[PDB]
């Protein structure tokens, strides 16, 4: 198989970078601040313009002290170490990274089309062919990531950006981890957690395949398979072993989803002897040309409205706050390898 060999060469390049990560590849003054694109508890994402090239980028700025307070040191180090080492068509690229007295900076490619989340909510739901086009890209991305011993752990429409060709660009490697055995961290988004995560069990890459079932259901239905007003209520629905499907779902889609949203780990698609091939060879994907999807040769169902290289209409507005850089170095030892 040429997929097996593509993956062999992809692991060769990844391991060299994983072992000798790039550090300090730019500095703040090389960038001009334009607008806040997003905010989080320990950081924010800014639209910025690179002075030397005129290129626009999405600069993620993390407050080191807030990362330390939230016990996300190791997760942040994983995120940067992984991002600088990976290379795949459906992943947002890390262009530069650096740190100063106060913050960590990850300069990513800017995807002006916004999150799938906004388009999905506005439209209501995607047709089966539209959902299939997006899902196929996640299938190939997880096959790529998992082959590098990486678990992604944060699949959701909020983390899937739509590029100018209408293809997905996966963002947020905050929970990504290189692990060969099982792992135990309680992390992810309530609607998307596999039962083994909720039940505090050791888990592996099968949680990403469960999250794919949640994503495909949400794209095709317009709502998640398990939802409620509070997370505990969502968890009780996830572990119950029951899923209801809208009447408009095709028999092939329901069959695929029963195999992905499988509470039993020995029966979950992507986790069996055939691995990812049980998904790729499923009836719902019969129409999918996996190589054409990878090559970006398939016509996209939706092309976002292009109104300039640095336009921001596909993103909400946020209060424009100061980027403070202290005169004293904060948390130096904790982020030494960043």
């Amino acid at each position: 198989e040429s997929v097996k060999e593509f993956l062999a060469k992809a692991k060769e390049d990844f391991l060299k970078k994983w072992e000798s990560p790039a550090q300090n590849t730019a500095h703040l003054d090389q960038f001009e601040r334009i607008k806040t694109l997003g905010t989080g508890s320990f950081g924010r994402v800014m639209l910025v313009k690179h002075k030397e090239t005129g290129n626009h980028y999405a600069m993620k700025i993390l407050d080191k002290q807030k990362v330390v307070k939230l016990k996300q040191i190791e997760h942040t180090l994983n995120e940067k170490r992984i991002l600088q080492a990976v290379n795949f068509p459906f992943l947002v690229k890390l262009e530069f990274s650096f740190k100063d007295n106060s913050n960590l900076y990850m300069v990513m490619e800017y995807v002006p089309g916004g999150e799938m989340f906004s388009h999905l909510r506005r439209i209501g739901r995607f047709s089966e062919p539209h959902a299939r086009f997006y899902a196929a890209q996640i299938v190939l991305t997880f096959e790529y990531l998992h082959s590098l011993d990486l678990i992604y752990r944060d699949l959701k429409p909020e983390n899937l950006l739509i590029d100018q060709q209408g293809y997905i660009q996966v963002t947020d490697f905050g929970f990504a981890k290189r692990v060969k055995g099982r792992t135990w961290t309680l992390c992810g988004t309530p609607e998307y957690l596999a039962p083994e995560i909720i039940l505090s069990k050791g888990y592996n890459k099968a949680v990403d395949w469960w999250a794919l079932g949640v994503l495909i259901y949400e794209m095709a239905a317009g709502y998640p398979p398990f939802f409620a007003d509070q997370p505990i209520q969502i968890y009780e629905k996830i572990v119950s072993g029951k899923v209801r499907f809208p009447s408009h779902f095709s028999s092939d889609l329901k069959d695929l989803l029963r195999n992905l949203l499988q509470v039993d780990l020995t029966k979950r698609f992507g986790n069996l002897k055939n691995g990812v091939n049980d998904i790729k060879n499923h009836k719902w994907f019969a129409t999918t040309d996996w190589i054409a999807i990878y090559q970006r040769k398939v016509e996209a169902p939706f092309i976002p409205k292009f109104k300039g290289p640095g336009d921001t209409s596909n993103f909400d507005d946020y209060e424009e706050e100061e980027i403070r850089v202290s005169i004293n170095e904060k948390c130096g030892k904790e982020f030494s390898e960043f």
Partner: peptide, 20 residues
């Protein structure tokens, strides 16, 4: 309808991750 019940819920906006 299930759609109506979702739209009237408090979880139709961008969903935050759990850390703990």
């Amino acid at each position: 309808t299930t759609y109506a019940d979702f739209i009237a819920s408090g979880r139709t906006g961008r969903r935050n991750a759990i850390h703990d």
